[PDB]
Design a binder for this molecule. Sequence first.
Ligand SMILES: Nc1ncnc2c1ncn2[C@@H]1O[C@H](COP(=O)(O)OP(=O)(O)O)[C@@H](O)[C@H]1O
Ligand SMILES: [Mg+2]
Lengths: 7, 139, 331, 8, 53, 370
Amino acid sequence: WXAXCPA
Amino acid sequence: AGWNAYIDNLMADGTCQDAAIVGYKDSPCVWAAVPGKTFVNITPAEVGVLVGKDRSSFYVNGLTLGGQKCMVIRDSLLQDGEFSMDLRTKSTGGAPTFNVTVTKTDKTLVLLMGKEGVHGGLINKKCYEMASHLRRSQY
Amino acid sequence: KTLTDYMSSELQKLFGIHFHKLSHKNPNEIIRMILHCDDSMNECVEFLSSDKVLNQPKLKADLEPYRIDWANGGDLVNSEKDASELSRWDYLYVRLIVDLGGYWNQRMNALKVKNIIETNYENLVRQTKLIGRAALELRDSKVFKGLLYLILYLGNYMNDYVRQAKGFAIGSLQRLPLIKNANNTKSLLHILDITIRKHFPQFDNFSPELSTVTEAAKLNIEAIEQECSELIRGCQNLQIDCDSGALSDPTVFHPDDKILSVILPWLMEGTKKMDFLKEHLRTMNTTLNNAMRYFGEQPNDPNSKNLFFKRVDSFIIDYSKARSDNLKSEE
Amino acid sequence: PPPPPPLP
Amino acid sequence: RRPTRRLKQMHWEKLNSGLEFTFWTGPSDEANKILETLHTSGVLDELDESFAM
Amino acid sequence: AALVVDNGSGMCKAGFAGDDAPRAVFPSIVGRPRHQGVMVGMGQKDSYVGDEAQSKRGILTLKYPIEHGIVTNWDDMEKIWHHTFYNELRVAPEEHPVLLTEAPLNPKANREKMTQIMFETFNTPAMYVAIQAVLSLYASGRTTGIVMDSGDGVTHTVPIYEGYALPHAILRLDLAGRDLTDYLMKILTERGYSFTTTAEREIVRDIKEKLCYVALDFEQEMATAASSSSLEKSYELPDGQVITIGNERFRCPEALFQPSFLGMESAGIHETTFNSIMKCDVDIRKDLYANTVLSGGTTMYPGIADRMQKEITALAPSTMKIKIIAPPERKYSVWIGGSILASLSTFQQMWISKQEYDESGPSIVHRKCF
Ligand SMILES: Nc1ncnc2c1ncn2[C@@H]1O[C@H](COP(=O)(O)OP(=O)(O)O)[C@@H](O)[C@H]1O
Ligand SMILES: [Mg+2]
């Protein structure tokens, strides 16, 4: 992700 | 002894200006009340509303007690433990309003309305006490 | 570890609620600032303006011997009647309600009217301008006239020969949605939307052209008129009070009472405000009235005077939904 | 009314 | 022009006040154009077929 | 000096009678570390509460002791109160009466439960419990009215009258701030931002407090939001990441007015306000409309007052006037009203004493302070 996790 | 003497006991402290006792069994009628006041004029129809099965109709426009308009605060007459009712008189043109309490016993209904500026809790605690005593006397 | 107030038990509760900001100050300090009519207690003065505080006959008798005859002599009525024995709030009530009760109701009236005028004259002029502009716009709109003529000409076509009237009221426009065709899919107003669009490009969209009518439908004419009319009554009642009423006499006034020193500067300016608002009040009435006959209705019916823009606005939204449904279904 | 009981 | 068949009848409220004060009395040339266009637009023909009971 | 302690689902407020602002305002959270400690000699505590827990929230498992009004853990609830007196206020409770607040339509189970833990663990000399809703309009300076009480746990609509609550007319709606924060995260993932854990639940709480607002017209605003980028705002994550939201500013707060967005059959507070006042008497109904008040941190959204005023006006008859009272200090209105109530001279009458409790027992609270 963008804000959070890696994705 | 002397049903009127309870009214004297009810008026010992002077925190109330009207007090009465009414037997709600069979034909309702006042057993003792303050002469010339509100509580002396209770009709059986008003008693039937107070002890009636319908516990929601008096929320739409209140009820009348001796012909004087009053609003419902909380209803706990038919619930075990308190058997008590709370009312506040309804007035027009900024006229003074007073707190009204009713306690239900085995045979009687005890009614107290205090003077101006008197908190309802004081009126409630007394009526519960004499109602508690009166039920201990099997009335 | 457990650890002579004539005032009623209930009332001590109310006094402490409103004057909480002044707990650290003595009665002598708070008795002084209130007479200044300062901005910091424009809210607390309303609490002492209530009927609850004033309508206390039993205390007024109790604190009467403690009153100071400030009207003449400025001396205590009785001999000693020390005020230190009284409690904190007891000192205030006798020195403010009982002592100044002769002009207390008059002074609060000068201050209650002071607050209401200071904030409503700005908006009241805005409301009366919108209604007058909306009435003039409706009267001076060819588009609104043109659609009514088209409706009348179409309406006379399907009507009988014995009922071929040349005019109708605005309130009759609600019958269009109530008429349906054979399959009930399309109502009478729905034909009008496609009829106007196909052949009358000038009448395609009149809602953006006339917008002030819609906002004018959210205001009550009688309520606004009564609200403004209340201001003039209070103003003229104030004039007879400051000039020839209880406020006129300054002998009963305390030296540290600038209530006379604050109302009089506004007295000249306040007269200007009521004159302008009176002109605007007359302007709205005639501006509504000339456009009122212009469409056949009368203000004598109170509902017609109030529900005049509502009926026009009701047709505006009704035409809007009719057009939206017509466009959605065909596209 | 029936006879009343003693007061508290 | 009158329809050949009876159609749906709409009912209005007659103006109690005199029509002279109303804008209906004023014979503006714009109103005359509405009648001329309506009689030639063919909308009246569609009314007969659709609005017949 | 009488203590006025305001236990709340989200924030806990405490101070002194007569003060104009709470002395200590700290979150009502309890934290227990989920990882073993390797650095010895620090004297690390077992449980962390309040600001200190919020400071180190990353390595803590925050728990709310109160959920949906009902206290789900009585062991933690004293700890935050224990931290409240000795740590935040630094005052011994043995010589000061304390004031706590109660919730509308509260079950009878709790009411002695706070009573039985204060006169015993902290042995406060005196006590009194009142409705937080009643104290709301007390700070507003009025005694009769209806309160639009909304907070972190629950929402209640109480049409007070001379300071005496109407139990039958009390309506309870389950649309609170925690629901919106939970609704904000499920809609924030549309933009590629995934916040799931409890520590970052405070982060979105911070975001909506600063960026979210109430839009006057939903249909007009989504059209404008899609068309233009003006409504978009940039927020800074504590790690330094930059985020931007386009239409979520007015969408999350809108669920307070459209609960079907969350899927709740019960409708918004605008009708619930109207629904509650339908239950009252007709003659008194005139007063209730013009003295409506807003309270709680949930009602902090910009443009919330005019939006509710517009909607209930359509619901209300055209004859009636509606006056939405929204004091800017209504965040601490419940606390301030209690300090006002405690400071009253007549307030000493309905004290419950330590001695009187001993002969009367826990049951005295139901009849003494009601
Ligand atoms: N400026 C703001 N904008 C939006 N929400 C806010 C704002 N300030 C506080 N809040 C919300 O209000 C809540 C505070 O609840 P609170 O009123 O303390 O509950 P209680 O009434 O039970 O004490 C917080 O959870 C927070 O999310
Ligand atoms: Mg709350």
